[PDB]
């Protein structure tokens, strides 16, 4: 009934041309008992109902205990159905188990997620499943074991691709995450945003969005620290 881990979260979001409403969507929600779920998507009132619904489906498959290849082709089937061509939407989705700190990620697109553990910053990525096996949406499904203190950073394509005069976007983000010293999720969100906006001198070509989640021990409020 009491969870061993807890989550602290932050989020920054900007719109095209310094606008007031963005078309990036994100959500971070408890998802039943012991899980916690983070999602970002790019690509209407009814639209965000259909999205949340497909996200719910993808959630349940991700959590089903199914082999990763099967999940991949199942998810492709789901997406082919209830999607058209001429819709090129992206989705990064991560779900943390709040008892063991295990985590399942699912990626559709070319925008990378990252874990920061101390001074390492790992890009979370899956292999191309072998040739001859089709993958219509280049869906990726990765499982990692997290530890307390870990940062998880997820971003929209607009912010990943945002830094001007920068050829390797992956490596630029990597560096900028390495260079942070704060462990605050929200400070980290806002800092990353400012670094890419600084690079384009204030102009905002796309909706830009990043969420950060720190993973902590769920230590009761009344606890005191112990000493050496």
Residue numbers in the entry: 587 to 629, 633 to 817
Quote the paper.
Previously, we determined the structure of SpoIIE590–827, a fragment that included the PP2C phosphatase domain but lacked the adjacent regulatory domain. Although monomeric in solution under physiological conditions, SpoIIE590–827 had undergone a domain-swap dimerization during crystallization. Here, we solved an additional structure for SpoIIE590–827 (with an amino acid substitution A624I that was designed to block domain swapping) that was in a different crystal form and was not domain-swapped. Importantly, the only significant differences between the two SpoIIE590–827 structures were at the site of the domain-swap. We hypothesized that this structure represented the inactive state because it lacked the dimeric interface of the SpoIIE457–827 structure. Comparison of the SpoIIE590–827 structures with SpoIIE457–827 revealed that dimerization rotated the switch helices (α1 and α2 of the PP2C fold, corresponding to SpoIIE residues 630–678) approximately 45° as a rigid body relative to the phosphatase core. Our structure of SpoIIE590–827 reveals that in the monomeric state, V697 packs in a hydrophobic pocket between the β strands at the base of the PP2C domain and the switch. Based on the universally conserved architecture of the catalytic center, the M2 metal of SpoIIE is predicted to be coordinated by the side-chain of D628 and the carbonyl oxygen of G629. G629 is at the junction between the switch helices and the β strands at the base of the phosphatase domain, such that movement of the switch helices could be coupled with bringing G629 into position to recruit M2. In support of this idea, G629 is not in position to coordinate M2 in our isolated phosphatase domain structures, which we thus conclude represent an inactive state.
